[PDB]
Design a protein around this nucleic acid. Structure first.
Lengths: 50, 49, 195, 93, 121, 107, 192, 99, 105, 136, 77, 72, 73
RNA sequence: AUACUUACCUUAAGAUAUCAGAGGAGAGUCCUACUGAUCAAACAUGCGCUUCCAAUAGUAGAAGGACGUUAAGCAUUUAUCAUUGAACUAUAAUUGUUCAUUGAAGUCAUUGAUGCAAACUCCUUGGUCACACACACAUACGGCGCGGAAGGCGUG
RNA sequence: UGGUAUGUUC
């Protein structure tokens, strides 16, 4: 935030003072370890019978 | 923690001053094992001195 | 094909090695920096005023307001307001560019000055300083400056400079005051200061 | 061909941006070099896991399909990519 | 919200409208679109991301709902993890004012091409 | 032989769309992209008998006051699970496949 | 290609006795000169012999433990000798062009007119005239100030700093030609 | 053979040849003999219906749809009759044809 | 931690218990295990008084490639040597042909 | 062998360690020993040996417990722990640094708040921390 | 040393015929052990002598053409 | 289409994360235009340790990001 | 040495088994035809939910989206 | 700005709405300032159409917020595991109770987090418009003013 | 049949 690698001069960098960091809150969806579709889908042989 | 001092009182003045102190102060939401934390910090500070 | 919106220059079929080299060259840097400066200056300088809404005011407000007093309007000529607004613009830009740098020059003889304040032996952002040196592939950019670098290494210890007053320090800068309100300074000091 | 959003992502190289991943981990750091496939590389990275904790990576490189979004700074509000009627000065033969 | 979104408009006509775009999670982004592509990657000016907590979801299941709003500003959202987009709020300036602004932009662009032709000579 | 051109001949058709999240969307079609990015107007959408993510997606679209009535919804292609057409429309005349007829005549 | 799956299919189709003329022997040994100059300005076009990765892996597995083939090494030595002779002829043509530019007609006429006026006090006047002639020669040589690269035969500069020179040395032409010179010197050290 | 190097504008003939003599033999048999098929989908929505059209993405038009799913809490079966349906090939797990 | 021992002279010169330890206790100096006898033999008198080419300068080539940076220095050193040799040959020929022309005229 | 085993068997490290542990209140010896340990790890990253990182942490902890009035070295070790990945240990180092001066040192508050401008991920907590720095 | 691309890495892994541990998708998926005999551009890997073990009693499986979209990680056991 | 810029990760230790927790720390030997990652001396890190053979190749579909564990 | 396309053209007319991604659907039948996108067509297939059977199916078309592998017995 | 050297690269194609008929060109293809129909775009234009456009005969109020205060408001819930020592409930990798040595990471936050509820203050928007402070309506309301903003339908 | 960027002299 003070010293940069950027090729732009300091007058550009004072115009490029970025946004403040994002306020993190707790997520709502399931994590990607639990992201899957439905298991135990039964066979279609019961529809062909009855 | 915050240190609080009482000095040079009789019995009734001690009662009235402690009651007037605890009638105005409002506590809340203490940490669970803060006693062992204070023990370790107190022993550390006096071992330093 | 590739077209730079900044430099207004075309290109051949879109190669990443050519497009990466285009954003490093100095002409693209100058045009991009000037364009960002002018667009920021335009969005600051655009005085988007509110659209006025004038209603038919009340009667007693008119008998109260038209009898209290009539104020005096001040106004200036064209060159006066132009010079004053130019001085205000240079004051706004010199306040936007400045910053307080008292802690850097006030802890200059500190034993950890070479580990935090040197800004090159810093831990988290020192690799960013050591990465892009702007390696000065022009010989004139390296032959122009003939002064010392004074690069303070991290390995400087407390054994070097033991007494900070024998090695000649600098007297600290006075607290700067506003030049428009400089005529109300106490002209008589408390103690006699020589030189 | 490429399109306006990938050109905007390639525009803000060397600036403090903030990513969010598909898992919920939010990254924030300086963009090293963006690509057309949005496989973006960041530096001085501060990371927030979906569990909640905060850590710091030095040099991250995330794949473009595992990105929820990325926040560019506000001075790219006014960009010539946003201009609708910008003419073209004589493309070469 | 009595906005009366246009009945025969597409993404080229919905530009600079305050969208309320829905995702797969439900993390609703509110902001003005300024660009799109074939994969529907949307840049969003002055954007805010709103969610509902897990405790509020029980009250939402069949009143006031306390949504969690974070401010993103100018972001650029991908088209993979989005679900649907609607038009929430109309912009500031009108269609005739945007038409006059587009004519001024066309005249300024023609003047810039005349300046490039004058500098080329 | 893409059947998105079949849906391009279905303008001003009052259909429903069940999404992969589980939401049923009742509304009239206006236009559809060849990537099946379909826009709809005069819309009411309902999450039947649950999925809390789908309830959040149902409520957080403005115009809830669980039938949600919205004026204009664009729907992405990969979120479309199935679309139910009205039974009064004749499928034998809208599936003529004039592009396939021109491709067969070009052979 | 526009899709990467066709690129991966192309990699599979080009990845999946051995002494046949279809196999490029310079690529079978390694560092074919038609490969090191593919897209640069010094390109030879396209290699007529085919290049393969499975044959290169089989040759590496054979040269690791099994045996070595001197015929492909001799063919690569002949190709490297022919390319080194062509590059040496190009470097000799560049040196002759530099010598012709240093010995132009008007430049030699101006140098002879300066040396005709170059002729204690007379020795000091002759030293001042020689210093003026050296300054005129330095001003004439500084109009181009282009040296000759000792390895790759390109043009260099003396007043140019080491960073632009280091940018010059990291190219496809210079890395390929230094690798070809290293291979040629290794084969001449093995043969002699 | 690589896909990009076959030809230009003749890939539709190879697609029809793969339709007639490939894995598409069951979707072709159902649309010409109007037999009902059972499509099991990725969310337990089993569909008994007749096929009206074929697509490269397996986008299938179905007429006289009888769909059935099972809610597991306790165990109930809920069905619905839908006249016209346009099913996406993303949702399709499997397609069974009865003789 | 192996091959380490934590010790402080504030508890050893005062002759107290717990003056040495192997684990990370706050306030102790880590020294080597084999040099603890050298630590005890050093403080003996205090206990006794208590009881009684000019290429690659690593400044320009910092933002370059880290892979081929060995041969790149060699090529630069070769180019500098060639530029020195071509200058030396020119200086030698300038004081030979002109000197012969001065002897002829 | 790695850099840690070469750091043990080196002749200069034992001499510097004995000169530190011989006179513990000579700060120049501590700084020479610390600079030699940092010079022994010329790449500083997370892929180095943790058996040496624990020794670096013990050396900094011993230096900050022997000399708690050093303003810059709490900042140095805190940004070192921030470079090594974690921020909870860096917050603990900042808290013990501000406790070493009893909440009244301007440089540590300034560096801790320049640190906290990026790592807090919470606005009300940043305002309570800046108001604590305001009132102290 | 040099660069080893993943297609040539799998090709050398095919030539050496080391014992192979192929991972898959998460908790539903089952880790397979075998020996590689064939692959293609979409990473549809053909394996032989396959014994499957769930995530923390293996059963033989024979010869398997494992598809690409479920392959996660390949190691040499 | 475009080759990803993993040239700076040529001889450095990296740490891939797989899908929410599987942290495979290895040494990058090679990559493709698909982000398939070849790792020498892989190591699974759990919040315990597990070794993953001498060489390994990891599919770019499950790869989310990668931490450069070694300094550049 | 071998590739999946000649192995899969030679896998036609054999009692093969296909497992799906869901660990509750496995179809074992005779393979008929397979395209370049590797869609599967089987005959007299049998459903296998977690190992145990439920009944015979017949001519069936298994989509390449939900396959996990195909085996040869 | 001219002159020269060097580093990288030198290009996925085809087409520009659809249907029917007539004519021309050596079953298939192309063209017609050729004709009828549908659709799209642009410019005008009208439908007693649909929705909205903030007091001034006062010191207000409509919409959206505060990443504002009271507010540390009120009611709840958590703030690490293992080995051993002196007792120990005890099916566990002594889990439970008091004290400690040691071992790996070790979110900050408990003035924290969730739910509930009121009041105050401040920001962006408007026609803050033209006449009048008025006795209309079961075919429920003379929508028969000058406009603006959004949209529907119809015509050229 | 060319483009982008960079370094010297006028």
């Amino acid at each position: 935030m003070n010293y940069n690698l950027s090729k732009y001069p300091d007058d550009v960098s004072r115009l490029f003072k970025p946004r403040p960091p994002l306020s993190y809150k707790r997520p709502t969806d399931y994590p990607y370890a639990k992201r899957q579709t439905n298991p135990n889908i039964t066979g279609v042989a019961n529809l062909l019978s009855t | 923690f915050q240190q609080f001092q009482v000095k040079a009182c009789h019995v009734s003045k001690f009662m009235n001053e402690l009651s007037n102190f605890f009638s105005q102060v409002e506590f809340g939401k203490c940490e669970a094992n803060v006693i062992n934390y204070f023990k370790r910090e107190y022993n550390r500070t006096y071992s330093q001195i | 094909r590739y077209y730079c919106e900044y430099c207004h220059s075309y290109l051949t079929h879109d190669t990443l090695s050519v497009r990466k080299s285009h954003l490093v060259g100095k002409n693209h840097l100058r045009i991009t920096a000037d364009y960002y400066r002018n667009k920021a200056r335009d969005i600051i300088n655009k005085h988007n005023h509110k659209r006025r809404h004038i209603g038919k005011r009340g009667r007693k407000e008119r008998e109260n307001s038209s009898q209290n007093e009539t104020l005096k309007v001040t106004c200036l000529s064209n060159k006066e307001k132009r010079h004053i607004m130019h001085v205000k613009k240079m004051n706004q830009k010199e306040l936007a560019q400045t910053s307080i740098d008292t802690l850097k020059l006030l802890y200059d003889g500190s034993p950890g000055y070479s580990k935090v304040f040197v800004d090159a032996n810093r831990f988290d952002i020192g690799d960013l300083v050591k990465a892009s040196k702007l390696p000065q592939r022009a010989n004139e950019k390296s032959a122009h400056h003939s002064f010392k670098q004074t690069s303070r290494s991290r390995d400087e210890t407390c054994e070097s400079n033991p007494f900070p007053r024998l090695n000649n320090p600098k007297k600290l800068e006075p607290p700067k005051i506003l030049s428009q309100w400089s005529n109300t300074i106490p002209k008589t000091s408390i103690f006699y200061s020589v030189d | 061909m490429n399109g306006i959003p990938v050109k905007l992502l390639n525009e803000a190289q060397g600036h403090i941006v903030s990513l969010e991943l598909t898992t919920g981990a939010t990254y924030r750091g300086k963009l090293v070099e963006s690509e057309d496939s949005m496989n973006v590389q960041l530096r001085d990275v501060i990371a927030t896991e979906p569990q909640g904790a905060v850590t710091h990576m030095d040099q991250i490189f995330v794949r473009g399909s595992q990105i929820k979004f990325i926040v560019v700074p506000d001075l790219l509000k006014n960009a010539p990519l946003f201009k609708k009627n910008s003419s073209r000065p004589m493309p070469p033969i | 919200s009595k906005i009366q979104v246009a009945h025969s408009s597409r993404l080229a006509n919905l530009i600079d409208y305050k969208l309320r775009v829905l995702t797969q999670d439900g993390r609703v982004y509110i902001g003005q679109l300024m660009a799109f592509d074939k994969h529907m990657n949307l840049v969003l000016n002055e954007c805010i991301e709103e969610r509902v907590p897990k405790t509020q979801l029980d009250k939402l299941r069949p009143l006031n709902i306390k949504v969690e709003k974070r401010v993103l500003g100018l972001t650029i959202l991908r088209g993979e993890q989005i679900l649907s987009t609607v038009v929430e709020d109309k912009p500031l300036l009108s269609k005739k004012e945007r038409l006059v602004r587009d004519k001024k932009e066309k005249k300024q662009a023609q003047k810039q091409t005349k300046l490039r032709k004058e500098k080329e000579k | 032989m893409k059947l998105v051109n079949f849906l391009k001949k279905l303008r001003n058709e009052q259909v429903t769309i069940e999404l992969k999240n589980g939401t049923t969307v009742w509304g009239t079609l206006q236009s559809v992209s060849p990537q099946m990015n379909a826009i709809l107007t005069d819309v009411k959408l309902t999450l039947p008998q649950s999925n809390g993510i789908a309830m959040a997606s149902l409520y957080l679209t403005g115009g809830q006051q669980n039938i949600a009535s919205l004026q204009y919804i664009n729907i992405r292609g990969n979120t479309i699970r199935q679309i139910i057409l009205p039974d009064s429309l004749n499928l034998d005349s809208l599936l003529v496949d004039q592009k396939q007829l021109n491709s067969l005549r070009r052979s | 290609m526009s899709t990467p799956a066709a690129e991966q299919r192309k990699l599979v189709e080009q990845l999946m006795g051995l002494h046949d003329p279809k196999i490029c022997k310079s690529y079978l040994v390694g560092e074919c000169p038609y490969d090191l100059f593919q897209g640069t300005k010094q390109s030879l076009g396209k290699c007529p012999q085919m290049h393969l990765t499975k044959h290169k892996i089989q040759y590496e597995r054979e040269v690791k433990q099994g045996k070595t083939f001197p015929e492909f090494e001799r063919e690569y030595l002949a190709i490297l000798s022919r390319f080194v002779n062509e590059c040496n002829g190009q470097i000799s043509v560049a040196l002759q062009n530099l010598k012709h530019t240093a010995e132009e007609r008007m430049k030699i006429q101006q140098v002879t007119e300066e040396l005709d006026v170059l002729d204690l006090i007379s020795k000091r006047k002759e030293v001042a005239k020689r210093v003026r002639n050296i300054t005129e020669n330095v001003g004439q040589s500084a109009q181009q100030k282009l040296q000759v690269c000792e390895v790759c035969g390109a043009y260099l500069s003396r007043l140019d700093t080491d960073r632009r020179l280091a940018d010059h040395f990291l190219g496809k032409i210079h890395l390929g030609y230094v690798k070809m010179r290293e291979d040629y010197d290794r084969l001449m050290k093995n043969n002699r | 053979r690589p896909k990009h190097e076959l030809s230009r504008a003749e890939l539709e003939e190879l697609e029809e040849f793969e339709f007639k003599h490939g894995p598409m033999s069951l979707i072709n048999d159902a649309m010409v003999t109007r037999t009902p098929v059972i499509i099991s989908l990725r969310n337990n929505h089993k569909i008994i219906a007749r096929v009206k059209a074929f697509d490269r993405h397996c986008n299938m038009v179905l007429e006289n749809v009888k769909e059935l799913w099972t809610e597991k809490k306790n165990v109930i079966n809920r069905e619905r009759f839908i006249s016209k349906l346009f099913l996406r090939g993303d949702s399709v797990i499997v397609v069974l044809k009865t003789p | 931690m192996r091959d380490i021992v934590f010790v402080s002279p504030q508890l050893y010169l005062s002759s107290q218990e717990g003056w040495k330890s192997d684990s990370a206790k706050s306030g102790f100096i880590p020294i080597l295990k084999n040099d603890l006898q050298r630590f005890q033999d050093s403080l003996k008198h205090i206990v006794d008084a208590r009881n009684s080419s000019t290429q690659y300068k690593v400044d320009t080539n910092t933002l370059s490639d880290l892979p081929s940076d060995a041969l790149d220095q060699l090529c630069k050193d070769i180019i500098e040597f060639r530029t020195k040799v071509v200058s030396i040959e020119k200086e030698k020929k300038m004081k030979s042909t002109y000197e012969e022309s001065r002897r002829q005229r | 062998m790695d850099k840690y085993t070469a750091l043990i068997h080196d002749e200069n490290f034992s001499t510097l360690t004995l000169n530190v542990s011989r006179y513990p209140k000579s700060l120049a010896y501590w700084e020479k020993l610390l600079n030699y340990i940092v010079k022994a790890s010329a790449p500083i990253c997370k892929s180095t040996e943790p058996q040496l990182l624990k020794l670096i942490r013990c050396t900094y902890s011993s230096m900050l417990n022997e000399f708690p009035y050093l303003e810059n070295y709490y900042i140095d070790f805190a940004l070192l722990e921030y470079k090594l990945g974690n921020v909870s240990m860096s917050h603990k180092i900042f808290q013990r640094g501000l406790q070493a001066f009893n909440q009244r040192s301007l440089l540590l508050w300034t560096s801790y708040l320049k640190f906290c401008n990026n790592v807090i991920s919470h606005q009300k907590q940043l305002f309570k921390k800046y108001e604590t720095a305001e009132e102290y | 040393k040099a660069m080893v691309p993943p297609i040539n890495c799998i090709f050398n892994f095919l030539q050496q015929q080391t014992p192979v541990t192929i991972w898959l998708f998460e908790q539903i998926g089952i880790r397979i052990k075998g020996k590689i005999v064939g692959f293609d551009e979409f990473m549809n890997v053909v394996i032989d002598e396959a014994v499957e073990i769930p995530v923390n009693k293996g059963t033989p499986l024979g010869k398997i053409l494992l598809k690409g979209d479920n392959i996660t990680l390949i190691t040499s056991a | 289409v475009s080759t990803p810029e993993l040239k700076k990760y040529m001889d450095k230790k990296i740490l891939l994360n797989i899908n929410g927790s599987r942290k495979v720390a290895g040494i990058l030997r090679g990559y493709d235009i698909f982000l398939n990652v070849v790792l020498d001396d892989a190591m699974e890190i759990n919040g315990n340790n597990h070794q993953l053979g001498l060489q390994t190749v990891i599919r770019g579909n499950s790869i989310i990001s990668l931490e450069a564990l070694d300094a550049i | 040495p071998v590739n999946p396309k000649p192995f899969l053209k030679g896998l036609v007319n054999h009692r093969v088994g296909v497992k799906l991604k869901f660990n509750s659907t496995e179809y074992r039948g005779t393979l008929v035809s397979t395209d370049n996108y590797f869609n599967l067509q089987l005959n007299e297939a049998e459903e296998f939910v977690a190992g145990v059977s439920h009944g015979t199916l017949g001519e069936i078309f298994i989509r390449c989206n939900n396959v996990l592998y195909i085996r040869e017995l």
